[PDB]
Amino acid sequence: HGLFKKLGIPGPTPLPFLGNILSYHKGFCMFDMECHKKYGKVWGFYDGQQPVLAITDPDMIKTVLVKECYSVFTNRRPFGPVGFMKSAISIAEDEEWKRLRSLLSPTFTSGKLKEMVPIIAQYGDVLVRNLRREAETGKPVTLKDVFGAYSMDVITSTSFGVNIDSLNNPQDPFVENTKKLLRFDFLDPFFLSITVFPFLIPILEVLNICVFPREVTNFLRKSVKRMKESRLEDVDFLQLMIDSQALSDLELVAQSIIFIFAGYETTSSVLSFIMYELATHPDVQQKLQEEIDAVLPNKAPPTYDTVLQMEYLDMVVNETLRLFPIAMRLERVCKKDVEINGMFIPKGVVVMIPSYALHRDPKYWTEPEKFLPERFSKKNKDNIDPYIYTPFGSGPRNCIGMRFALMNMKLALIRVLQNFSFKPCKETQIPLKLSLGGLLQPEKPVVLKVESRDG
Numbered sequence: 001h002g003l004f005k006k007l008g009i010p011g012p013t014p015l016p017f018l019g020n021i022l023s024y025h026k027g028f029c030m031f032d033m034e035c036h037k038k039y040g041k042v043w044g045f046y047d048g049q050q051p052v053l054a055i056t057d058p059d060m061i062k063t064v065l066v067k068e069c070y071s072v073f074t075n076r077r078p079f080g081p082v083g084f085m086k087s088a089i090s091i092a093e094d095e096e097w098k099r100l101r102s103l104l105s106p107t108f109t110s111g112k113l114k115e116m117v118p119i120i121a122q123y124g125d126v127l128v129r130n131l132r133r134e135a136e137t138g139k140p141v142t143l144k145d146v147f148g149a150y151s152m153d154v155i156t157s158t159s160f161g162v163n164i165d166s167l168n169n170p171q172d173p174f175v176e177n178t179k180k181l182l183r184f185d186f187l188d189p190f191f192l193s194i195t196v197f198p199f200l201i202p203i204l205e206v207l208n209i210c211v212f213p214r215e216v217t218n219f220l221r222k223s224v225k226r227m228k229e230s231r232l233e234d235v236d237f238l239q240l241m242i243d244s245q246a247l248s249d250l251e252l253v254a255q256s257i258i259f260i261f262a263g264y265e266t267t268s269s270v271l272s273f274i275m276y277e278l279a280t281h282p283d284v285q286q287k288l289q290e291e292i293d294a295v296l297p298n299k300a301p302p303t304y305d306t307v308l309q310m311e312y313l314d315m316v317v318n319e320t321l322r323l324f325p326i327a328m329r330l331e332r333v334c335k336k337d338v339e340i341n342g343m344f345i346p347k348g349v350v351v352m353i354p355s356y357a358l359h360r361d362p363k364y365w366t367e368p369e370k371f372l373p374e375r376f377s378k379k380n381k382d383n384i385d386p387y388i389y390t391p392f393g394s395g396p397r398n399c400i401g402m403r404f405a406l407m408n409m410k411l412a413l414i415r416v417l418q419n420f421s422f423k424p425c426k427e428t429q430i431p432l433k434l435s436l437g438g439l440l441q442p443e444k445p446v447v448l449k450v451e452s453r454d455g
């Protein structure tokens with residue numbers, strides 16, 4: 001625990017064995033907000049015994065995320081016991097990650113994204129139908145239930161060329177199982193013990209103990225094999241992975257499960273945050289509709305080219321991701337002793353970039369608390385540092401599905417907003433309050449009321 005002292009870097013005093021984890025009672029976002037304000041440009045703390053160095057300087061951020069990615073800052077914090085999911089790209093290391101990256105990245109080229117628009121359009125139709133049902137009754141909507149089903153429908157069909165039709169089944173197996181893959185929350189004596197005694201991880205790995213429920217991984221393990229069967233019995237993410245067979249049968253499933261979960265969880269999450277922000281700013285919700293109407297007059301179906309035309313939509317999406325970067329923190333492990341922009345960083349340290357905190361630094365963002373889409377306007381855009389604003393990370397190891405998620409959320413949003421308007425109702429949580437999880441999640445689902453437009 002003497003490390004940060006010895007290095008001259010400040011921070012909260014750790015407890016023996018525990019480190020600074022009891023500070024996690026208010027969530028990672030408040031912890032990082034506090035430290036940033038108290039300690040300044042750079043601070044340090046201990047997740048159990050693991051030193052974590054938070055950095056704030058934009059050029060220093062470019063160094064660990066971009067310049068020295070391959071050389072020293074390549075991998076993320078080790079995570080286990082993880083079992084067969086060690087193959088997964090998001091937790092793969094060094095050259096294994098490198099070749100997994102160059103394999104799967106063509107999945108999301110412009111051109112392949114264009115192909116996905118007519119495929120998503122079908123589910124866009126089922127989306128507007130389900131919400132219309134809720135606009136007729138006047139009943140409240142748990143948005144995570146409808147945008148989730150939509151996210152799940154979109155990512156299965158674009159990646160595996162299979163229509164699991166989640167949007168009509170409220171009790172679809174692909175959504176029940178996939179949502180029960182994270183969940184871990186604060187103070188679970190499992191994850192808590194693993195942060196404090198990470199030397200236990202090997203034993204758990206040896207006893208075949210796993211973070212993910214085997215029930216849930218069995219179903220996902222099965223489902224993907226069935227989907228792989230269909231393609232081999234008559235070019236997307238699936239196809240791209242079959243062709244490499246250098247993927248093992250189990251490595252393929254690992255990658256799939258990443259994309260399935262990322263598809264479902266990430267997309268619907270952000271969508272709920274966007275929807276909330278619009279419903280609580282109808283001034284902004286209307287200005288967006290005006291734009292959607294102008295670029296696509298009388299309910300004209302959206303296209304890849306027309307999405308790129310909607311400047312205000314992109315502003316609104318950007319501004320939500322500023323307040324709600326679901327990853328909260330970027331991180332990368334230091335492979336070897338190094339000096340960067342003047343600062344010594346020892347081997348083994350976790351270097352952490354506090355996205356959430358920096359998106360609210362009064363130094364770069366005037367009135368950081370407020371939802372103001374005008375921040376990202378063409379005339380204002382050039383004062384934003386691209387290393388301060390990092391909803392999708394930066395460099396060779398950024399979010400592989402960035403552009404897909406942006407297009408797909410914009411697609412849903414267009415289909416929704418050209419048809420409906422969203423008003424806050426009874427059950428709606430104002431102000432919004434966030435869970436104490438590993439990804440950014442609201443405590444109690446976002447509930448809004450749905451009105452139809454004109455007549």
Ligand code: HEM
Pocket residue numbers: 089090091097101258259262263266267270325326327330331390391392393394397398399400401402404405406
């Ligand atoms: C708007 C929704 C999304 C947000 C805000 C988001 C954000 C992020 C962030 C911040 C990271 C870490 C990047 C870094 O460490 O620099 C990441 C990684 C990753 N994301 Fe996303 N993401 C989203 C959607 C998606 C989607 C739709 C997919 C797949 C279809 C996906 C797949 C991945 C993968 C595979 C990684 C690990 C990359 C690697 O280590 O090679 N994400 N994402």
Ligand SMILES: CC(=O)N1CCN(c2ccc(OC[C@@H]3CO[C@@](Cn4ccnc4)(c4ccc(Cl)cc4Cl)O3)cc2)CC1
Pocket residue numbers: 021047077079085088090091184185186187188191192195258437438439
């Ligand atoms: C399959 C896959 O791609 N991935 C597996 C899941 N990965 C992931 C996601 C979130 C995440 O944050 C987990 C949370 C973050 O904080 C702790 C400790 N911790 C682990 C890593 N960094 C900090 C924690 C400490 C003590 C207590 Cl009581 C509860 C928790 Cl919670 O786990 C850690 C890892 C993301 C990548």
Ligand SMILES: CC(=O)N1CCN(c2ccc(OC[C@@H]3CO[C@@](Cn4ccnc4)(c4ccc(Cl)cc4Cl)O3)cc2)CC1
Pocket residue numbers: 028076090181182257258259261262265266327328329330331399437438439
């Ligand atoms: C709280 C904290 O310290 N941290 C929060 C989590 N941070 C983190 C670390 C790694 C990471 O890798 C992206 C991986 C890639 O896919 C997912 C979902 N996802 C999130 C953003 N983009 C995709 C994912 C897939 C499957 C499962 Cl089971 C769980 C998760 Cl998530 O995260 C995404 C986020 C690590 C640090």
